[PDB]
């Protein structure tokens, strides 16, 4: 039937960036220009494709990776970027063909006192490989002495809370991000606009 974009975009809750959500979308008709023609998104960048040309095109599989980050970190959801998000949470490949769609979600994802339900990884020994999801909660060894699951000196909790408050600066407010990855393989194309 019609591709479930509403399920992805209009979800009650979103994932933390470290444990980003992926939705495989296949065997349906998708109107990509009805998404672009939705006056609400603060970001609609497309890499290796156009949002109109997207409609009259066929793909093997299309993924929808959703998560929440702060606005000044939306710049890192792009090919060849660096920062705690690109490096330790969500990395896009250089040869990325897809679209990055973001919007201010301060109305839903910021509580008075602080929303502590949204996390991001602050510590990691090395950068993530493109499309890698690291959900390890293992106590981070910043020294020579082993941690053995005990948080303490030189033993950090890898994940940090965003603490979204409604009084935060616009750049430091929660933004909901959806990344559409377009896959094209030798197998038949099950996702199209007007076929």
């Amino acid at each position, epitope marked *: 039937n019609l591709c479930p974009f509403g399920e992805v975009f209009n979800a009650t809750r979103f994932a933390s960036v470290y444990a980003w959500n992926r939705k495989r979308i296949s065997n349906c008709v998708a109107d990509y220009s009805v998404l672009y023609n939705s006056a609400s998104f603060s970001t609609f960048k497309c890499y290796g494709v156009s949002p109109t040309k997207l409609n009259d095109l066929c793909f093997t599989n299309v993924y929808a990776d959703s998560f929440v980050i702060r606005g*000044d970190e939306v710049r890192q959801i792009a090919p060849g970027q*660096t*920062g*705690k998000i690109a*490096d*330790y949470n969500y990395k896009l490949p250089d040869d990325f063909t897809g679209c990055v769609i973001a919007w201010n979600s301060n109305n839903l994802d910021s509580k008075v006192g*602080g929303n502590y339900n949204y996390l*991001y990884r*602050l*510590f*990691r*020994k*090395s*950068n993530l490989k493109p499309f890698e999801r690291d959900i390890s909660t293992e106590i*981070y*060894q*910043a*020294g*020579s002495t082993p941690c053995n699951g005990v948080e303490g*000196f*030189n033993c950090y909790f890898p994940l*940090q809370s965003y*603490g*979204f*408050q409604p*009084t*935060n*600066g616009v*750049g*430091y407010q929660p933004y909901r991000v959806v990344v559409l990855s377009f896959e094209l393989l030798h197998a038949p194309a099950t996702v199209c606009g007007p076929k």
Partner: antibody
Amino acid sequence: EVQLVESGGGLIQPGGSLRLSCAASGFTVSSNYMSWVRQAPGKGLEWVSVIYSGGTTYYADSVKGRFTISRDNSKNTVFLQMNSLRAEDTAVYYCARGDVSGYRYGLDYWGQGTLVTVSG
Amino acid sequence: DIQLTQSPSSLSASVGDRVTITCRASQGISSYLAWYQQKPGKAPKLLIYAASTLQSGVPSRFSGSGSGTDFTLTISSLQPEDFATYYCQQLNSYPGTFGQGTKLEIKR
């Protein structure tokens, strides 16, 4: 205990180059964010540069393109290569463990400082 | 750009007095703020991190409060050794702006 020891400071003529070092013992520099903060004589503090566990580096606008931060994992040292030095760069340079952006912990361990005097 | 306005610039206080220093941010920075104590000829020492969390080793008389824009540092019962310049620092984004400093003088 945790110790950070700077070296490499001194007098350098305007336009010159200097390489500060920071030998750390008590933690692993490669597993940590390592910042450099400077203090102009009689003035306040100012962050200069940072090096992530994963390799990413960031600089303050005032030093972008002139300074380079790096590290030696075997020596547990952090380097800051300052090039094209001007009189404004005359300051006590400190290295510290931590980061200044989204890093709630702040700069906990700091070096003793090393005076870099840019003068003719 | 995040501007940090730390006040007072200077303050003289007798031993045993309760001293408060304020730092005000131009934008909402949540709890991303730290307080440092700098004694003459020595590197800054971290006192409070995450706006209100006291650092290990720091005496109980130091306390942090505030979230969003207005933050304060309090020294419940000032000691002679507490003479130093105190700096706040925003840890929300680069370039990790520090306050102007508050030079604390011991009244004697």
